[PDB]
Amino acid sequence: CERIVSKVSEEQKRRPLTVVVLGASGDLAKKKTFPALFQLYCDGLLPPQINIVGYARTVEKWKHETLTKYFSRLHERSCHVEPFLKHVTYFTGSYDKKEDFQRLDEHVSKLEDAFDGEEKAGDRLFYLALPPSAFAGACGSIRAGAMPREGGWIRVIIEKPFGHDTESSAELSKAIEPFFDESQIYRIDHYLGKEMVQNIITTRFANRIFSALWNSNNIACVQITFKETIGTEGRGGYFDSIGIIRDVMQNHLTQILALLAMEKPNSLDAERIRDEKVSLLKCIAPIGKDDCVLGQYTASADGSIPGYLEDETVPKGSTCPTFAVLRLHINNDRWAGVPFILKAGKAVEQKYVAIRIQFKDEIRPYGDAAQRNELVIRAQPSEAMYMKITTKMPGLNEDLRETHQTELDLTPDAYESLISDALRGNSTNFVRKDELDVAWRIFTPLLHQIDKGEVKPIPYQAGTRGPKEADDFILNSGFKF
């Protein structure tokens, strides 16, 4: 076993803390949210007497059969389960009724009153593990009957997706505005909780080596790639209305892009970083249909993976893409002329999430005896960072032009990091309202053209790389194979 060492600041031990997880009976709350809160407790990042309240429409048995079922690190951290569950309560009610939250306010005040300490005006964090259509209703009820006492703050975590295009996303944002302002809203794009995504800023802005290189004077091409070997796996009916671009590219990969391309913030203040992400996204023209290649996977030739259209849930004649390569143009002084390629595909040759920065040739004096340097940042399956460079061939050579390619190799759930950040008031890794709308406007005209059938995906066998047209598209964009 191990001892719990509190890493929490004293400033956070001043007031009671209540974390209300709406939808506590739903899959996300019990598969992601509560398991994360448990790991946070074991990491010593929750204040000592936090109150965690599960909230669902549907108690000590429930805490031990359904919640712990999805916990992890049990062969090493099983000694802390009961002390953690001592912090968990269950509250039954609806998600959209004012009086059900007045009851919660009394129930939470009952837990707030039990804090060891004089201050009873506790801080309150609401995690809406709810379907998106319930966000506005819950936010309205919380505001009307569950605000904190004087002194304590309130924060509301909501997760993507907020809409499926500019219109739908903007309407949800407008519905929540009357109830909470941006300093109180914490929108989750869970890629921002990944270690490699958070390390982009430090890599870029703490090191002169990377700072001096990170512009169009030296970079030829940037690629951000998501690959998976699996398909839709029967649930193609849910994927058919989403598509690969909305599922991974408009949200996740575009967040990676914003961090990869933004200007340096003068400080590490949360809003200064989000200011620079927004400022970059505003430099990006809408993606036209000439800057994309779409694909839709068929049977794997081995029979292992069936075709996408072979799922009975998928409407026949579907134009839904399971593969997409997109080229974006960033119109500013750092990036003018540099192609940015977003690639994402299901049922391709390997499982892989990575960034590839291709540098310009050093044309002289080596010419063909050199190759473009690259920086690769890989997140999945295995984390890695390395530089590809040209070095002389080891051993006895006849001339300096004998070279080879070699590498300089670098030697916690996402919700844990984001929930911890929310508790501290750090919104760096959360999507701001204006950021959400700019990103939607980059992709929405293409998404509308696709839905109207103007862009027909190219068939490719499951397990291959994707349409051959996509590889030629990438080469004609300025990437060298």
408 contacts which partner out of a second copy, ligand NAP, none, CB within 5 to 8 A by kind?
A: a second copy
Quote the CA–CA distance of 250 and 161 in Å, as a whole number: 10
User: Does the protein bind a second copy through residue 11 (CB under 8 A)?
Assistant: no
User: Does the protein bind a second copy through residue 322 (CB under 8 A)?
Assistant: no
In single-letter form, the type of residue at position 301 comes to: A
User: Does the protein bind a second copy through residue 373 (CB under 8 A)?
Assistant: yes
Q: How far is the CB of 194 from a second copy (least distance, A)?
A: 12
314 contacts which partner out of ligand NAP, a second copy, none, CB within 5 to 8 A by kind?
A: none
**Cα–Cα nearest to 481, from 397, 384, 374, 335:** 374
376 contacts which partner out of ligand NAP, a second copy, none, CB within 5 to 8 A by kind?
A: ligand NAP
Using CB under 8 A, which of 322, 420, 427, 444 touches a second copy?
420
- What is the residue-wise DSSP string for 133-197? GGHHHHHHHHHHH-PPPTT--EEEEEES-S-SSHHHHHHHHHHHTTT--GGGEEEE-GGGGSHHH
Q: How far is the CB of 135 from ligand NAP (least distance, A)?
A: 34
Whether 252 is catalytic is yes
Using CB under 8 A, which of 114, 147, 268, 336 touches a second copy?
268
In single-letter form, the type of residue at position 132 comes to: P
Its sign, for the CA torsion 38, 202, 339, 276, is positive
Neighbours of 294 (CB within 10 A): 26
If DSSP codes are grouped into helix, strand and coil, which group holds residue 355? strand
What token pair was written down for 103? 């009851």
Radius of gyration of the chain (CA): 25
Q: How far is the CB of 260 from ligand NAP (least distance, A)?
A: 15
Kindly report the CA angle at 117 between 111 and 120, in degrees rounded to 5? 50
Helix 270-281 crosses helix 433-451 at what angle (to 10 degrees)? Answer: 30
What 272-276 contacts at long range (C-beta under 8 Å, 24+ apart), as own/partner pairs, is: 273/201, 273/428, 274/427, 274/428, 274/432, 274/435
User: Does the protein bind a second copy through residue 372 (CB under 8 A)?
Assistant: yes
**If you search the block for the tokens 């940037």, which residue do you land on?**
222
Q: Exactly one of 252, 329, 404, 448 is catalytic; which is it?
A: 252
Q: How far is the CB of 355 from ligand NAP (least distance, A)?
A: 10
Q: How far is the CB of 261 from a second copy (least distance, A)?
A: 17
**Cα–Cα nearest to 360, from 340, 338, 378:** 338
Candidates 75-83, 246-254, 341-349, 414-422 — which segment interacts with a second copy by CB under 8 A?
A: 414-422
Q: How far is the CB of 401 from a second copy (least distance, A)?
A: 6
225 contacts which partner out of a second copy, ligand NAP, none, CB within 5 to 8 A by kind?
A: ligand NAP
Quote the CA–CA distance of 124 and 335 in Å, as a whole number: 42
Quote the CA–CA distance of 249 and 161 in Å, as a whole number: 12
Using CB under 8 A, which of 396, 452, 453, 481 touches a second copy?
396
In single-letter form, the type of residue at position 307 comes to: G
**Cα–Cα nearest to 103, from 94, 114, 130:** 94
Nearer Cβ to ligand NAP (51/223)? 223
Q: How far is the CB of 26 from a second copy (least distance, A)?
A: 25
Site for a second copy in 228-247 (CB under 8 A): none
70 contacts which partner out of ligand NAP, a second copy, none, CB within 5 to 8 A by kind?
A: none
If DSSP codes are grouped into helix, strand and coil, which group holds residue 352? strand
Contact footprint for ligand NAP (CB under 6 A): 223, 225, 343, 356, 376, 388, 465, 471, 481
Are 19 and 125 in contact by the 8 Å Cβ rule? The answer is yes
Q: How far is the CB of 480 from a second copy (least distance, A)?
A: 13
Nearer Cβ to ligand NAP (136/357)? 357
User: Does the protein bind a second copy through residue 6 (CB under 8 A)?
Assistant: no
Nearer Cβ to a second copy (332/390)? 390
385 contacts which partner out of a second copy, ligand NAP, none, CB within 5 to 8 A by kind?
A: a second copy
Are 354 and 252 in contact by the 8 Å Cβ rule? The answer is no
Nearer Cβ to ligand NAP (110/480)? 480
471 contacts which partner out of ligand NAP, a second copy, none, CB within 5 to 8 A by kind?
A: ligand NAP
Greatest pairwise CA separation for the chain in angstroms:
85
Site for a second copy in 323-362 (CB under 8 A): 359-362
What token pair was written down for 429? 């890794």
CA distances from 357 to 154, 222, 354, 366, 410 (A): 41, 5, 10, 21, 16
Binding region for a second copy (CB under 8 A): 7, 40, 43, 45, 195, 198-199, 201-203, 205-213, 217-218, 264-268, 359-362, 364-366, 369-370, 372-373, 375, 385-387, 389-392, 394-396, 398-401, 403, 406-412, 416-417, 420, 424, 426, 428
The catalytic residues are 252
